[PDB]
A paper describes a structure:
The first committed step is BCKA decarboxylation by branched-chain ketoacid dehydrogenase (BCKDH). Branched chain ketoacid dehydrogenase (BCKDH) controls the rate limiting step in BCAA degradation, the activity of which is inhibited by BCKDH kinase ([name])-mediated phosphorylation. BCKA flux through the complex is inhibited by E1α phosphorylation (Ser337 in the full-length human protein) by branched-chain ketoacid dehydrogenase kinase ([name] or [name]). BCKDHE2 makes up the complex core, and [name] and PPM1k are thought to compete for E2 binding to regulate activity.
The terminal methyl group of S3 positioned at the cusp of the lipophilic pocket filled by the halo-dithiophene motif of PF-07208254 presented an opportunity to improve potency by filling this pocket with lipophilic groups. This work culminated in the discovery of two analogs, PF-07238025 (cellular IC50 = 59 nM) and PF-07247685 (cellular IC50 = 3 nM) with PF-07247685 having a cellular potency three orders of magnitude greater than BT2. The profound potency improvements over S3 and previously known [name] inhibitors can be attributed to the addition of the branched alkyl chains present in both molecules. Figure 3B and Supplementary Fig. 4C show the X-ray crystal structure of PF-07247685 bound to [name]. The central thiazole and benzoic acid of PF-07247685 overlap with S3 and make similar interactions, while the butyl cyclopropyl group extends into the hydrophobic pocket of the allosteric site and makes extensive hydrophobic interactions. In contrast, thiazole [name] inhibitors PF-07238025 and PF-07247685 increased fluorescence signal with EC50 values ± SE of 19 ± 1.7 nM (n = 27) and 2.2 ± 0.35 nM (n = 5), respectively, also in line with their in vitro inhibitory potency values, suggesting closer [name]-E2 proximity with these compounds, and thus [name]-E2 stabilization. In contrast, binding of stabilizers decreases flexibility of LBP residues, which may stabilize interactions with the E2 LBD, leading to the increased [name]-E2 interaction seen in the PPI assay. However, PF-07238025 and PF-07247685 protrude into the [name] ASC, which would physically interfere with E1 positioning in the cleft and prevent phosphorylation. [name] is then stabilized on the BCKDH complex, protecting it from degradation and leading to [name] protein accumulation. Conversely, thiazoles PF-07238025 and PF-07247685 very potently inhibited [name] activity but did not improve metabolism chronically and were associated with a BCKA rebound at low compound concentrations due to increased [name] protein content.
Numbering used by the authors:
A (entry chain A), B (entry chain A): 24 to 306, 332 to 374
The structure:
């Protein structure tokens, strides 16, 4: 690329808007909170993009040369250009034009991860470091989550969604968000297998607290698709009589724990170390190998964890932990 | 100590009798299997003792000087002397005299761990390495388990216990051994709290396989005492209505998994890193701090693991894994 403008922002450090600082925006009888947030987003978005362009520049030359990798690298450069070229936000007209660019760039970059994984897969013969692919995809996925959180938050500040301040839900019920995806995952499972296991939810079912549901909107359907597929493939002779998937909610002052326990035979000993690798699968629902590593990258980025406990021959317990807001 | 006889056996490596090699002893119409095993035990017992005397010699001087530590060190030296002084086993008379010495030495050393922990506790002010105490107690406990397995196996070869070849049960049912300790632990819990949680056992309830129950005879009552105490202390207002402790058996070709799931509020975040430390407790049943670290040292020595999964505010799932025989 050899661009000096990008070099300037690759070294300047990132600024993360804390959940409490995000909530401290509600100047309704003025609209001054809208401009304050947009002025931050305008400055922060190119820094995040440049930090990732730096990652593409640090890829070994032979890999960075792949036409698909180069295309995604080019996309990140043009995105940085489009964002920095925009003049500073002064009024409601300057804020509105930025929101349109952000929405277009959020749609132009929707398939970056799929192109990146393909480019990296195509380059397997030249990849010497086994961790290279995992660390590059982990960092790309978490950078995008960070960007998508800031961008979606500012765009949602224009909506008057009940119980929400942008992307922060002030009254989130973990039981309701689980229920929302349980019915969705059962429909996908029913389509493939003719049936789906019934889901039972116990624990702190009435817990309510402020939280950002965005990461849970990815993790929960992925973990439910895994638990349901496994339960069906291990009860092939009785597809009509499959054991329930039991979800437990544990809410304490430190974190939120969601445990998903299935009776799907568990993860085999030989596969136990490969399940967290990108592309690894034993099979859209399945046939991807992204659900587990992406969900862990997500949980860890947000101060939590994704831990698996396999009981080979019986089932698996998946523990999703996420740190509380503030 | 400065004893040259012990120096000779501290360097000679250990020989471990594999489960299949132990089972290959049943020369009933001769009694030749009895002498072959005793001739091994006579040679192996001083090597194990010397390897541990070497550990006492490697303790920092200030700690090894503690009167309690010195007493246990002296006990190990006198044990090595008594065993090596015995003349080689040639007939049924020479085998019988060794069995009496082994039974006496197994009774003389019954309180070694309690004296050792006390001596180490007394020396806390001089202990600089935090891992020193954990590693010394882990190595002492596993050495003793190894010795107790060999000694008890040979002594049990004289018994005609059904479904057993010394200490190996040919038809072990994990459900039955769990049941055996469940009623025992409930009696101890009832004595302290006025009630105990009912225990539910599911999974591979009818699994049967060859196995050494000795380590399970320690781990299961300890893990059940922990799950029951926790369930009672978290349901103080309703001691009469406490949630069940649910045990799941998973039997596959690689290992045996026993999961103990309680609804006892879980292990607090602040205590989560200290629970595996010797002496750490939040309180004979309780007030010891040995149950968890000893059980893990045991599981790992036998090619398995002891893993804890805390759901703070709800309960804890404890996963005991043990590698299969052969
Ligand atoms: C060049 C900077 C831009 C584009 O930033 C992004 C960030 C995230 C996404 C996005 C769309 S769908 C999505 C996703 C969802 C679930 C799980 C994984 C992903 C993922 O693909 O990362 N993220 C798109 N553009 C602000 C203009
Ligand atoms: C000097 C070598 C000897 C003595 O060897 C041992 C080994 C083990 C034990 C023993 C008794 S009770 C026991 C225990 C049970 C459950 C959990 C922990 C322990 C423990 O104290 O290690 N182990 C005693 N003497 C063969 C003559
Ligand atoms: N609950 C589970 N029980 C059994 N196997 C599982 C479970 N969750 C995941 N797996 C295994 O891990 C593999 C990778 O999972 P994942 O990353 O979600 O991708 P996918 O399911 O789309 O292939 C799966 O193909 C499956 O073999
Ligand atoms: N199932 C459990 N639920 C909650 N706390 C537990 C559980 N198991 C162990 N603990 C905690 O770990 C501490 C140490 O346990 P352990 O080593 O068994 O010793 P003890 O229970 O005799 O004190 C206990 O004092 C208790 O605070
Ligand atoms: Mg998946
Ligand atoms: Mg205990």
């Amino acid at each position: 690329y050899n661009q000096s403008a990008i070099d300037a922002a690759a070294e300047k450090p990132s600024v993360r808007l804390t959940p409490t600082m995000m909530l401290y925006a509600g100047r309704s009888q003025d609209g001054s909170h809208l401009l304050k947030s947009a002025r931050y987003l305008q400055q922060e978005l190119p820094v995040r993009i440049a930090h990732r362009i730096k990652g593409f520049r640090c890829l070994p030359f032979i890999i960075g040369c792949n036409p698909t990798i180069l295309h995604v690298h080019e996309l990140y450069i043009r995105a940085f250009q489009k964002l920095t070229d925009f003049p500073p936000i002064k009024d409601q007209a300057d804020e509105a034009q930025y929101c349109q660019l952000v929405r277009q760039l959020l749609d132009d970059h929707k398939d970056v991860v799929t192109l990146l994984a393909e480019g990296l897969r195509e380059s397997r013969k030249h990849i010497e470091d086994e961790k290279l692919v995992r660390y590059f995809l982990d960092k790309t996925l978490t950078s995008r989550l960070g960007i998508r959180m800031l961008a979606t938050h500012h765009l949602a500040l224009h909506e008057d969604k009940p119980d929400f301040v942008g992307i922060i839900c002030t009254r989130l019920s973990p039981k309701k968000i689980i229920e929302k995806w349980v019915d969705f995952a059962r429909r996908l499972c029913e389509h493939k297998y003719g049936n789906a296991p019934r889901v039972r939810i116990n624990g702190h079912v009435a817990a309510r607290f402020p939280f950002i549901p965005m990461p849970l909107d990815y993790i929960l359907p992925e973990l439910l698709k895994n638990a349901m597929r496994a339960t069906m493939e291990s009860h092939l002779d009785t597809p009509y009589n499959v054991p329930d998937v039991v979800i437990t909610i544990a809410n304490n002052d430190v974190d939120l724990i969601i445990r998903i326990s299935d009776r799907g035979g568990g993860i085999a000993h030989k596969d136990l170390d490969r399940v967290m690798d990108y592309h690894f699968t034993t099979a859209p629902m399945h046939g991807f190998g992204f659900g587990l590593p992406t969900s862990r990258a997500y949980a860890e980025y947000l101060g939590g964890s994704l831990q698996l406990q396999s009981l080979q021959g019986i089932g698996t317990d998946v523990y999703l932990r996420l740190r509380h807001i503030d």
